């Protein structure tokens, strides 16, 4: 029995059955459809420039209690509105508004990382000035 045929001339049946089950698989689907290119904000790119517009004070999911100090961003090549977790302490004050920041993902491939709901992306630079560098004063942001 077992389901799956066994004849020596049924490889067509096997491939097409497998094709349907690969459509049921996860990464085959979004890869062959180009969700990353047609619906995702980045366009399947590792990073992306962006312009912050305003600030947001998303509270943390349970079981936890904080406010995560994220921001609202628009891209340039696309023009889509994105939220982004300003990672470290004081960095929001570093990245107040109008800044041509750089964004990337979290490390979970299109999902939110921790107790930070609605956010998949974060900031890594400010007009070519790194946020860890700003945080540790190894470099400093052009004021104007």
């Amino acid at each position: 029995g077992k389901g799956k045929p066994r004849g020596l001339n049924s490889a067509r049946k096997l491939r097409v059955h497998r094709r349907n089950n690969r459509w049921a698989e996860n990464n085959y689907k979004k890869r062959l459809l180009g969700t990353a290119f047609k619906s995702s904000p980045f366009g399947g790119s590792s990073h992306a420039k962006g312009i912050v517009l305003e600030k947001l004070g998303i509270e943390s999911k349970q079981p936890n209690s904080a406010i995560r100090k994220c921001v609202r961003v628009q891209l340039i090549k696309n023009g889509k509105k994105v939220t982004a977790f300003v990672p470290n302490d004081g960095c929001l004050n570093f990245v107040d508004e109008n800044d041509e920041v750089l964004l990337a993902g979290f490390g979970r491939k299109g999902k939110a990382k921790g107790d930070i709901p609605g956010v998949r992306f974060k900031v890594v630079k400010v007009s070519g000035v790194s946020l860890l560098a700003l945080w540790k004063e190894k470099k400093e942001k052009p004021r104007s």
């Binding site: 004070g57 406010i67 100090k69 302490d89 004081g90 960095c91 929001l92 004050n93």
Partner: protein, 57 residues
């Protein structure tokens, strides 16, 4: 509770202490030599389970 302020709180409020001076440590193969002569011929901490960073006990 309106906490969309206070960013940088503890990093500003922290009492600034600075790194004391000490000699430059061995580098490379010298470091691996230090690790060997600390871990094996120095029998300094083998009590039951070989700690490496003994807190003051």
């Amino acid at each position: 509770h309106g906490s969309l302020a206070r960013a940088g709180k503890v990093k500003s409020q922290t009492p600034k202490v600075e790194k004391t001076e000490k000699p430059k440590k061995p580098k490379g193969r010298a470091y691996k030599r230090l690790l060997y002569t600390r871990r094996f011929v120095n029998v300094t901490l083998v009590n039951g389970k070989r700690r490496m960073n003994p807190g003051p006990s």
